[PDB]
């Protein structure tokens, strides 16, 4: 009586149940694991807070309306302030982590709409100015708020044009990245497990984000007659196999 459909994920002191899942994706078919010695470089023993950092943090909720263009969060940024995960983050020189991402959106059998939930490794954004204008730090570190693709261009911020993925590629091809759809008629959640993907064994958690999670409405939300025209979307994310190394004074970052 197991269905692909019902699932339970327990991680730390927190549990999620979905009764309307559509399997789960594990990026590149690899599950998060700690850093092996053969791959290690820094000689420091690392710190593995385990259950105090590897639990589920639910970010603040978004509201899908007929005019929504899509939202974008960066990792580990989105979690920069969650509990002890965040403290560890500002206090060590280097850290490394994988995540379980669970995006939630329920409706009824009269609604229609379909969101794309995708994880993009190394999502370098484009400046809407063109040329070689850079995208300032603050703009690519929105924190739990994430970036709202239907917000206005700002100065020093990225471009927010959806048919171009914020980088000069077409929305249609985002499907080459680990992703899952939430089609109100099928699905009510999306779950993706992200292994740590980098060109170095461990890195800085503040100067470099290693994935952007993106939720994009593709088939517009259509509510039943005289229904309220909107649904909330909630994102809950859990660091998994986290390791921190090179402890010290506590980083100070712009803004």
């Amino acid at each position: 009586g197991y269905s692909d459909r019902v699932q339970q994920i327990t991680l730390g002191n927190s549990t999620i149940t979905t009764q309307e899942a559509a399997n789960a994706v594990v990026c590149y078919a690899e599950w998060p694991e700690y850093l092996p010695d053969v791959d290690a470089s820094d000689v420091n023993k690392t710190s593995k807070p385990d259950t105090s950092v590897c639990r589920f943090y639910t970010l603040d909720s978004k509201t899908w309306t007929t005019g929504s263009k899509g939202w974008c969060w960066k990792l580990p940024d989105a979690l920069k302030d969650m509990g002890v995960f965040g403290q560890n983050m500002f206090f060590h020189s280097l850290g490394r982590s994988g995540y379980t991402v669970h995006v939630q959106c329920n409706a009824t059998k009269f609604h229609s709409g379909c969101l794309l939930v995708v994880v993009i490794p190394e999502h370098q954004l484009a400046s809407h100015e063109g040329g070689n204008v850079s995208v300032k730090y603050t703009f690519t570190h929105p924190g739990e708020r994430g970036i709202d693709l239907s917000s206005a261009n700002e100065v020093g911020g990225p471009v927010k044009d959806v048919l171009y993925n914020m980088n000069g590629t077409l929305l249609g091809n985002l499907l080459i990245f680990p992703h899952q759809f939430i089609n109100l008629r099928t699905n009510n959640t999306a779950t993706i497990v992200i292994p740590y993907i980098n060109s170095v064994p461990i890195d800085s958690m503040t100067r470099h984000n290693n994935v952007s999670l993106m939720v994009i409405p593709i088939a517009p939300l259509t509510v039943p007659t005289g229904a309220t025209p909107s649904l909330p979307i909630t994102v809950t994310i859990a660091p998994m196999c986290t390791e921190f190394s090179g402890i010290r004074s506590k980083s100070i970052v712009p803004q």
Partner: protein, 273 residues
Amino acid sequence: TVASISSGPKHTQKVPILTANETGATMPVLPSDSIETRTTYMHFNGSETDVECFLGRAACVHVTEIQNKDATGIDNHREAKLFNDWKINLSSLVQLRKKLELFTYVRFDSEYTILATASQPDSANYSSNLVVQAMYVPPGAPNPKEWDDYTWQSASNPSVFFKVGDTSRFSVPYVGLASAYNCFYDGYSHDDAETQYGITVLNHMGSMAFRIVNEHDEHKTLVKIRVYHRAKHVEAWIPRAPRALPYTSIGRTNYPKNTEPVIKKRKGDIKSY
């Protein structure tokens, strides 16, 4: 190898063509799941689509130019193209760039070919024979200042001398600092509020300097350098969506404003053929 097996009528409870794309999978459906097929063999291996093959041919990565002329009274050799620099990078000419950016991280050895041809746009009695000297100036090593500085001694820095009209060829191991080169980097060099964003901060490998070894003749000679790059021993990770809009800058993803629609509009209906 069979490309298609033989398959006949079906009346089952087992439907391989109905799936749920919401899952993120592309189910491996074949012609024989939905029509009646006959056996056929592949006769093919997919040899020429190997990434080593795809990135393994020489591509032009840079065209520069230097001239041989009397430096007498020149206050800025660099500025007179008495020599010149190439702030090495592969992202400057777009054909090869779109190919590499199909991947996120890439690792390979480089084979460089350098073709040098001379031009004599204004009245010369003859064509002189010039020797070019291309020198590798890595980060932290003294940049040349005149076309005949102590720098050109290049006692510790590789340098190749070849003749204009000829070609020079040598191969450099993968010089990246990390395990792969980042084709993309969503980071900064530090948490500064105004530091540059992107890959330019990362893909810092120094530069190349070219000069003519010959002193000047009576006429002036323009030498134009073309650098070709071939990846050998390629390794590529994490495929990405191909580049759709035009490029504007080395190392940023930025596209131009008021660009044009990249998807061709139908001449007719959705229903049109």
